[PDB]
Amino acid sequence: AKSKAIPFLDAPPALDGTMAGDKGFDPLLLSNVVPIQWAREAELKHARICMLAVVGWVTVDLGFTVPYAPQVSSLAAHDAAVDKGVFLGLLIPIALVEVLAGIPKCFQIMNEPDASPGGDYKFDPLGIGASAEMQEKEISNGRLAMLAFSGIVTQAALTQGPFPYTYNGVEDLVPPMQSVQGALSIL
Amino acid sequence: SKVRVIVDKDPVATSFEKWAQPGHFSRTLAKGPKTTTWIWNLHADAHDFDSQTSSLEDISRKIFSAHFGQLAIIFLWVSQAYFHGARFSNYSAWLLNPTSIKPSAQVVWPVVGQEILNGDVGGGFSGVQITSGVFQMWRASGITNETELYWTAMGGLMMSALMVFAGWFHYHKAAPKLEWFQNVESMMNHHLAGLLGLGCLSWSGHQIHISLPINKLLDAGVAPQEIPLPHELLFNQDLMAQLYPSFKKGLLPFFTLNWGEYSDFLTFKGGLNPITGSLWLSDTAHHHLALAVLFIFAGHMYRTNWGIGHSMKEILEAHKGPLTGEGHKGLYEILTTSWHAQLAINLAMMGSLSIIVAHHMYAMPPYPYIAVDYPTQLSLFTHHMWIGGFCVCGAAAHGAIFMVRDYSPVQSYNNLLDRVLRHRDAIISHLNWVCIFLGTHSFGLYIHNDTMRALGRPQDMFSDKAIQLQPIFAKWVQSLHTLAPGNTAPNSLATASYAFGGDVVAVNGKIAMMPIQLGTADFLVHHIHAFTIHVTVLILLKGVLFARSSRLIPDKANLGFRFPCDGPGRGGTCQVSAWDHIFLGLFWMYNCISVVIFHFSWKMQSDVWGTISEKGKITHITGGNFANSALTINGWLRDFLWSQASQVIQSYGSALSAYGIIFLGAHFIWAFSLMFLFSGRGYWQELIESVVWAHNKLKLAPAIQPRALSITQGRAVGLAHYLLGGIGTTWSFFLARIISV
Amino acid sequence: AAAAPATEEAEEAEESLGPVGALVGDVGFDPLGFTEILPLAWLREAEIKHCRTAMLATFGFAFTDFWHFPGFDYTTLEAHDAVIAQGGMSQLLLWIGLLEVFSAISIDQMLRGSGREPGDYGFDPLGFASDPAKKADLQMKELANGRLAMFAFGGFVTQSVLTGNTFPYLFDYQTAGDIVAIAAQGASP
Amino acid sequence: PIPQFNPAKAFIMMFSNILIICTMSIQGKSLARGTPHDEMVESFGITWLLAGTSLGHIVGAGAILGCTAAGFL
Amino acid sequence: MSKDLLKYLSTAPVLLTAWMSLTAGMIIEIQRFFPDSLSF
Ligand code: CLA
Ligand code: CLA
Ligand code: CLA
Ligand code: CLA
Ligand code: CLA
Ligand SMILES: CC(=O)O[C@H]1CC(C)(C)C(=C=C/C(C)=C/C=C/C(C)=C/C=C/C=C(C)/C=C/C=C(\C)C(=O)C[C@@]23O[C@]2(C)C[C@@H](O)CC3(C)C)[C@](C)(O)C1
Ligand SMILES: CC1=C(C/C=C(\C)CCC[C@H](C)CCC[C@H](C)CCCC(C)C)C(=O)c2ccccc2C1=O
């Protein structure tokens, strides 16, 4: 039984077919050591934080800014908000949600036999529905947003520049934008 | 997962029912008192959990909950010092001038004329002078404000309440099973990493971010009320970079292994800070970092749930040789099934550690302006000496208790314990010969010096102007330490301590630390120390080894750990128990520690402490008389005791009069001890009978019949009174002497 | 499984909360699990005492911001120290301490299990809840008012010190400006 | 964590990690002792890599700091 | 209080400590109000 992702490594025995997002990708066999619901808790918390972080970073960089906030880029927004003295106030909703939800949920994941799964906070106010197709969409967007925020921060620190976070803008993304004469000179 | 948490739920109901039934823990005392011996037996057997229950699990649970209660008491004791510094002290006025203001954090109530004890400690304050050194300890942490002391006291009260709750919780709600306590590898890993290494790491972090900038600004001359608050220094790379120009690079050189960029605040310069006469705090933070890394590294050694790690059973059983038979086999079961063995090891380690602390904190003053505070240095040295001596006696006591109770011959056949027990006469004989040789030599040189000086023959003495006894090995070691920076400590600026030779360190006239010269008197008193330590070892080791049996009494283990005798038979079997050996060895511990602290006090007052004037003129407290007067017993009697008791006997009518009162009272208690120590039970029982006749005549006979104290209790009372009187007399004498000069 | 109907990613596996509906307003809100280590009756008594104290405190804070007795010419934030120096707070402490010593004896008898429900002293002279059908409803109203008054008093003292104004406890730009402005805002108010 | 543009610093730490991992020993089992890779994956799992990289990082830190004090990096 | 906590408070050491504290307090307050009395 080989894994679906790695065709030459054996399949991890803790990932059968359930738990949406299962591509059979687990080298290091971390599912054997870390409990699987705890790992889903951590993955989905990271996913949601990274989604909100990507959208906030891009939104502040594009120019959207609420009144009385410092009109700076998202790279310097952290230091500007700390210097203004209001960025500590964001901790109180974070402290409320994280303590009073995550701490009992983490303890019940580790201790209680029957408990809700990792991302299952049962939030759902509108009632869209937690279908198996929607969970796959959530976790795919979350993994994409994690890699995206990593890349966005690492490139924005290197360039200190505008939204594309490359050294020459979107022209680095599209090589036909940049001097196709040299390409034509060899045809 | 072998290492797991297994816990019983609600084992013991919380009720005020056995509170009203004293003596409930034991079978004999629970039936009610008939004589006035049940009271003393109730007090003696309160903490002897091994005689109350035969289950090791319940004993371990009681031990754990009692540890929590003890930690609560210690947290309250930390909170008292912080609160008295916050509200009842002159700590701010001491911060503004820590060389002329005497620390004081204890004020008395005027009711009976005792308001004379509120002496003029300086700074517009009246109170009792403090020799604890808490002021310098707070200054080393950057606690320049009096609000932080108050909040530290409040946090200490909160932590004490937490420990009280935890102690109730782990005995009445969630008491761990026996398999939880026996995870000694897990306990060892968790202590070595999480307690020691993480405490060192967190304290180094606090030092680097708070105490280094605040103490640097304080030594720069900035007044404490214009110094940035520690929370303003914690998150300000600009201000720290102004102070230490390495925070500009941030945490990047730490992760790139370019640790040489952090040499601004992590140094190995050594020596003493000239401004404060103490160790450099950068050296202290670097020291704590090295310790944190070492301890966290050491905490990864023993096997837990995962396959890596060591088993301590396999390490011990592999260490065996030809001359020792089976080696360390069976010691793992001994130390995982008995608490008394763990006490016997841990008390010895803690006493030796306290003695090491005493020897290290005087030659290496670690707190600012603590070296020029002579009462603090003397009090800390003598304190840690007495604590170490008491703990090292208790180690032998619990080794004897283990040997009487928890020893098993089937478990410990032919291992190290068995081989030690099979030749104990050779050990005790050779240690006896060493004690006699050391005593005859070390004391007879003093007596010979007394005789030569009394006969008018100073040229025949054992002195530096006569037949010399130079400690050549100690001088060679001192010369090796003085030449260490550059040669064997190449990245070092100064020596480890100036006691090994070097330069005199002075802070505002007073001497912080200067080289200590060793002569023939130092040789003589070091041999006295070795002899006293050897005799204490002889008594305690003879008590431990002969705890089970001897040639005199073959069945001593069947009589118990403590028992008065085995009758007047065999010529007399008085004080044969191992308890009586601990009782006899406590006196010799007292003698040894008294001689050690007398040596320290006289040598430091004579050759180190003093003043410096223009052109480096050194004037010590006593005048350098230790070299020629510490060679005779008359010299000790006349020049130390008689000459330095003048401060304690003339303290009446001044702020030090409580020291004279305690001097007289401790003499009274010490003499009161000999009443119990010399007399015997039967005389007191007959006198009690004569008193009971008068009581019976006046219809006043108590139903709880009055009895004399038991023989073991009489010895214990006499020993406790002797120790209290001696330690009180020395305490009052030292404090009244060193405060007033 | 019986999930808590106030968190519901967590169960009522905090079974120290007891049966559902044993107390009024029981929505199973115990995330940190204080009921595991403490009795429920003592926590309920503390809660109801806090509710009533905070209700009286909120009303007194606002009233002292509006009116005061003659001779008590002190503001609300300085009434504490001024009346301590005057001596009235000693009288308050003495009489409240007498009533609270009686309450201490009451809690001691209740925890040993005499008859008492927590927070019930029988003090209903006007007979509002002498009908047993209206007892269970007025308890919830008392609770909700007490919780809201706890939060209200905390906000009252913190905004009164933070800004330095009377009963609105608002900044100058929130009363002497425009909060429902839709124009392009500046960079300060 | 990575060095500031130093390729020599990277080689010391990676070589130390590889050398430690190949020269480990748990319960008498070791790649150098002639004991196969697949069952050491089976018997230990990620504990093998974690312990090997921890000891390799300690050894590499010591070697890097020593060669920096002498002169190289 | 309780029927068995009061019995614990009725023990000899607790009662001795409480009564000695009361006596010491009474004598100390007498010395505070009527100090330095040699004669009657
Ligand atoms: C990972 C998530 C994340 C993080 C860490 C940040 C971080 C940041 N964002 Mg941001 N953002 C995000 C997601 C995120 N964003 C998303 C998803 C969006 C798009 C919707 C935005 C849109 C956005 C804008 C438009 C702006 C920021 C800004 C900022 C900066 C300052 C924020 C601040 O001071 O908060 C302060 C927090 C508060 C004022 C609210 C605290 C709540 C108070 C204390 C009350 C607490 C509740 C109380 C207990 C109950 C109610 C009480 C009352 C009603 C009675 C900071 C760097 C600002 C900035 O400076 O950029 C330059 C800015 O203008 N962000
Ligand atoms: C890293 C984990 C850790 C830590 C820190 C400790 C710490 C301690 N254990 Mg312990 N223990 C552990 C794991 C740990 N243990 C494990 C895994 C086992 C089972 C094998 C045991 C079994 C055990 C027994 C059987 C006993 C102890 C005892 C003790 C205390 C020794 C007394 C002392 O040095 O006072 C130092 C005092 C302090 C450091 C004060 C702080 C006290 C708190 C509780 C320490 C932890 C605080 C917290 C985790 C840190 C928060 C950081 C935050 C501020 C950011 C000490 C508090 C003994 C004791 O005293 O019992 C009460 C005792 O009898 N332990
Ligand atoms: C880690 C410290 C530690 C611990 C946990 C123990 C624990 C124990 N010891 Mg032990 N011991 C210790 C240190 C320790 N000891 C030291 C340091 C010594 C050397 C002095 C001894 C010497 C010793 C002997 C000789 C004996 C024990 C015994 C015992 C056991 C019962 C104790 C009991 O019920 O006493 C109950 C507690 C008391 C009666 C209180 C004693 C109060 C003292 C004597 C007075 C203190 C005066 C105070 C400091 C100043 C007063 C000032 C004045 C003005 C009022 C128990 C297992 C006995 C036993 O049978 O073991 C199985 C026993 O015979 N121990
Ligand atoms: C000042 C009082 C004093 C003196 C001199 C001694 C002397 C001694 N005690 Mg000791 N002891 C004392 C008080 C004293 N004790 C008290 C108060 C207690 C009660 C707690 C004890 C409890 C006690 C115990 C429990 C033990 C001792 C032991 C010893 C001996 C140690 C071996 C040694 O070096 O002997 C050498 C002699 C001396 C140190 C004293 C004389 C030195 C002279 C000046 C030099 C040599 C003189 C020479 C022999 C004779 C020449 C003159 C002659 C021809 C006229 C030694 C005989 C231990 C022992 O005997 O084991 C070996 C032992 O186990 N004692
Ligand atoms: C049981 C009755 C009683 C009595 C005799 C007192 C006595 C006193 N209170 Mg008082 N107090 C009480 C109950 C009582 N308190 C209760 C239950 C509370 C609420 C918990 C308070 C709250 C309180 C505060 C907040 C203050 C006092 C103050 C005072 C002092 C006023 C000094 C002065 O100049 O008088 C002023 C005299 C008058 C204004 C004249 C009119 C007063 C009339 C004659 C009182 C009526 C009789 C009275 C109710 C006695 C009971 C009779 C009985 C039949 C019920 C005085 C020591 C004040 C203080 O300490 O200042 C020094 C202060 O500020 N009290
Ligand atoms: C159900 C119900 O009842 O109520 C609902 C109501 C409500 C509020 C709707 C709910 C919700 C859901 C919410 C709030 C969902 C928000 C989800 C969010 C915010 C999802 C962002 C993803 C961002 C991504 C994928 C970024 C990719 C970025 C990628 C892939 C890049 O490559 C970027 C790139 O930069 C790199 C990395 C390098 C650059 O050189 C080049 C570019 C620029 C191309 C709740 C909580 O469910 C409750
Ligand atoms: C005096 C004495 C007694 C008699 C001692 C007894 C009966 C102790 C009495 C204890 C009392 C009752 C405790 C309280 C003491 C006083 C009532 C309070 C004094 C308080 C002062 C601080 C003022 C012995 O039983 C004994 C036994 C073995 C060796 C030596 C001796 C010994 O020397």
UniProtKB/Swiss-Prot annotation, chain B:
Chlorophyll a' binds at residue 667. P700 is a chlorophyll a/chlorophyll a' dimer, A0 is one or more chlorophyll a, A1 is one or both phylloquinones and FX is a shared 4Fe-4S iron-sulfur center. It is a multi-pass membrane protein. [4Fe-4S] cluster binds at residues 565, 574. It is an enzyme of class 1 (oxidoreductase). The chain crosses the membrane at residues 63-86, 149-172, 188-212, 284-302, 339-362, 378-404, 426-448, 523-541, 581-602, 656-678, 716-736. Its EC number is 1.97.1.12. One of its GO terms (biological process) is photosynthesis. Chlorophyll a binds at residues 675, 683. The keyword Cell membrane does not apply. It catalyses: reduced [plastocyanin] + hnu + oxidized [2Fe-2S]-[ferredoxin] = oxidized [plastocyanin] + reduced [2Fe-2S]-[ferredoxin]. InterPro entries: PSI_PsaA, PSI_PsaA/B, PSI_PsaA/B_CS, PSI_PsaA/B_sf. Gene3D superfamilies: Photosystem I PsaA/PsaB. Keywords: 4Fe-4S, Chlorophyll, Chloroplast, Chromophore, Electron transport, Iron, Iron-sulfur, Magnesium, Membrane, Metal-binding, Oxidoreductase, Photosynthesis, Photosystem I, Plastid, Thylakoid, Transmembrane, Transmembrane helix, Transport. GO terms for molecular function: 4 iron, 4 sulfur cluster binding; chlorophyll binding; electron transfer activity; magnesium ion binding; oxidoreductase activity. The PsaA/B heterodimer binds the P700 chlorophyll special pair and subsequent electron acceptors. PSI consists of a core antenna complex that captures photons, and an electron transfer chain that converts photonic excitation into a charge separation. The eukaryotic PSI reaction center is composed of at least 11 subunits. Belongs to the PsaA/PsaB family. PsaA and PsaB bind P700, the primary electron donor of photosystem I (PSI), as well as the electron acceptors A0, A1 and FX. PSI is a plastocyanin/cytochrome c6-ferredoxin oxidoreductase, converting photonic excitation into a charge separation, which transfers an electron from the donor P700 chlorophyll pair to the spectroscopically characterized acceptors A0, A1, FX, FA and FB in turn. Oxidized P700 is reduced on the lumenal side of the thylakoid membrane by plastocyanin or cytochrome c6. This is Photosystem I P700 chlorophyll a apoprotein A1. It comes from Emiliania huxleyi. The lineage of its organism: Eukaryota, Haptista, Haptophyta, Prymnesiophyceae, Isochrysidales.
Swiss-Prot record, chain E:
The chain crosses the membrane at residues 12-34. The keyword Ligase does not apply. Keywords: Chloroplast, Membrane, Photosynthesis, Photosystem I, Plastid, Thylakoid, Transmembrane, Transmembrane helix. It is a single-pass membrane protein. The keyword Plastid applies. One of its GO terms (biological process) is photosynthesis. One of its GO terms (cellular component) is chloroplast thylakoid membrane. It holds the Pfam family PSI_PsaJ. Gene3D superfamilies: Single helix bin. It is found in: Plastid, Chloroplast thylakoid membrane. Belongs to the PsaJ family. May help in the organization of the PsaE and PsaF subunits. This is Photosystem I reaction center subunit IX. It comes from Emiliania huxleyi.
